[PDB]
């Protein structure tokens, strides 16, 4: 059924969002380590590059998500 | 200077998205379970879900405001 | 008999219009249409005509065949499914204002290269067709515009950054400003929904 299919997709999305989350850990962590060690101009490009790496994983899960929301809301009307 | 509160910002913005999935997904589990069968009792969750929601836009608004204070600072 | 269907509504357009820029853009989607061997093209370029049929000498008649053109010229089948929602959203109810958010949104995602922008959008478009002439399928739309807006402004921070402390923070005050307008109008439909249910 739609439901059903709509679970399962819920539940997927829910693992890639709990892996998105410790992205944002593990890039936390990285940011304030790579401040300890010596902050540089192509150092603070780096960090933003992988900052907007990030973002845009996290921006993705995060359209699917309202995505899923919206068929759902067509669902229930 | 203004890379380094940038990065700030971002990781600011990172840590409330993540609050956001899991509120949003709160939501979409009780519409799904709304859909199965009707329950008065999911409504007050609904509602709670989107008070925490809520809350989220307002921290968002106050970073928004942060980074407003930091243009000012630069252009004048 | 869809090819059928569309050469006799081209028939019908240039009994009606006679050296009108309609007319020559709509026998322009026909020539398309018929060397393109796509049937969801063939669907929206008949959609597209008989919408200016309905509404001759009219700017959604006109948008909607520049739409129409952007649509074909477009290889992704899944814009010419968002843009056939979209123009069947337009011939349903013209003269509201779910046909502008559906036209603008359908001419963004031609434009849109990203797949979950168009996922949305197409998700946001069903469920305006399903209950149409609400207050909830104008707020649908809506959102999915503002969607895409931030997936473009995330694009243009990007590029910004590849290259200026100014620009940066003005892209990213631009960013969290249609930010909160997405969850906002997100509160909304979730408000809606609570005394849908209820």
Same mark, same amino acid.
Request: glycine share 0%.
């Given at each position: 059924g739609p439901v059903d299919e709509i679970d399962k997709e819920v539940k997927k999305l829910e693992e890639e969002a709990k892996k998105s989350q410790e992205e944002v850990e593990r890039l936390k962590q990285e940011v304030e380590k790579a401040s300890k060690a010596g902050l540089d101009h192509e150092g603070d490009s780096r960090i933003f590059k992988k900052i907007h790496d990030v973002v845009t994983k996290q921006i993705k899960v995060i359209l699917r998500l309202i995505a899923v929301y919206a068929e759902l809301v067509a669902i229930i009307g | 200077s203004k890379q380094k509160e940038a990065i700030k910002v971002y990781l600011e913005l990172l840590e409330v998205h993540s609050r956001v999935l899991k509120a949003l997904i709160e939501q979409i589990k009780l519409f799904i379970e709304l859909i199965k069968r009707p329950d008065e009792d999911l409504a007050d969750k609904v509602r709670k879900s989107s008070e925490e929601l809520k !809350?989220? #836009? $307002?921290?968002?608004? $106050?970073?928004?405001? !942060?980074? &407003? &204070? #930091?243009?000012? $600072?630069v252009k004048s | 008999?869809?090819?059928?269907?569309?050469? +006799?509504?081209?028939?019908?357009?240039? +009994?009606? %219009?006679?050296?009108?820029? %309609?007319?020559?853009e709509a026998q322009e989607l026909a020539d398309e249409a018929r060397k393109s061997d796509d049937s969801e093209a063939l669907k929206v370029v008949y959609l597209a005509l008989r919408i200016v049929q309905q509404l001759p000498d009219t700017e959604l008649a006109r948008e909607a065949l520049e739409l129409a053109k952007e649509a074909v010229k477009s290889t992704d089948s899944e814009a010419l499914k968002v843009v056939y929602l979209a123009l069947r959203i337009v011939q349903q109810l013209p003269d509201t204002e779910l046909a502008r958010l559906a036209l603008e949104l359908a001419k963004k995602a031609v434009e849109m290269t990203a797949q979950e922008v168009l996922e949305i959008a197409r998700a946001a478009l069903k469920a305006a067709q399903a209950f149409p002439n609400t207050e909830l399928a104008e707020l649908m739309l809506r959102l999915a515009e503002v969607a895409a807006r931030v997936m473009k402004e995330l694009e243009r921070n990007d590029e910004e950054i590849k290259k200026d402390d100014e620009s940066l923070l003005e892209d990213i005050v631009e960013l969290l400003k249609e930010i909160i307008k997405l969850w906002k109008i997100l509160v909304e439909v979730s408000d809606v929904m609570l005394k849908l249910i209820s």
């Open positions: - | !809350k989220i #836009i $307002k921290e968002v608004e $106050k970073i928004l405001r !942060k980074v &407003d &204070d #930091i243009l000012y $600072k | 008999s869809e090819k059928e269907k569309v050469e +006799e509504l081209a028939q019908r357009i240039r +009994e009606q %219009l006679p050296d009108t820029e %309609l007319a020559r």
